[PDB]
Design a binder for this molecule. Structure first.
Ligand SMILES: [Pt+2]
Ligand SMILES: [Pt+2]
Ligand SMILES: [Pt+2]
Length: 140
């Protein structure tokens, strides 16, 4: 569940708005093969803005699942946005976002937006992973 305006990659490589995704649309997975989106859902609520270095901010819902990497080389961990918000900063600094090109990115801030915002979401087959326009790996 991402904020409207988020740009995702189709199976061919071109971009598509998250609000423009429809049932059966072909997204791009982190391994290069295609993904099928289905069960489109929309809403409007106060979202969480995750600011990381280099890459554009990620605005998502409270129940959004983040595919992160944790130190101790690195281990792959899926964690929801709410639990990650509740973790202390000393623990938050151990988690990293990642993009497919295997670049690791520091998560350095995450705050709740002031005003509500429209959001769109869906489910993804296979490993349930898809790519953002900047190749950031995202989970259902
Ligand atoms: Pt979601
Ligand atoms: Pt909710
Ligand atoms: Pt997962």
């Amino acid at each position: 569940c991402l904020q409207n305006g988020t740009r995702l990659l189709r199976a061919d490589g071109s971009e598509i708005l998250v609000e423009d995704v429809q049932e059966g649309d072909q997204l791009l997975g982190p391994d290069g093969t295609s993904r099928t989106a289905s069960k489109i859902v929309r809403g409007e609520e106060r979202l969480y803005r995750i600011k990381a270095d280099e890459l554009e901010d990620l605005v998502c819902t409270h129940n959004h699942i983040l595919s992160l990497y944790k130190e101790r080389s690195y281990e792959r961990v899926d964690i929801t946005v709410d639990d990650f918000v509740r973790l202390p900063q000393q623990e938050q600094q151990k988690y990293r976002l990642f993009r497919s090109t295997a670049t690791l990115l520091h998560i350095m801030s995450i705050d709740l937006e002031e005003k509500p915002t429209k959001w769109s979401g869906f489910v993804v087959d296979k490993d349930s992973l898809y790519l953002r326009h900047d190749y950031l790996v995202l989970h259902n």
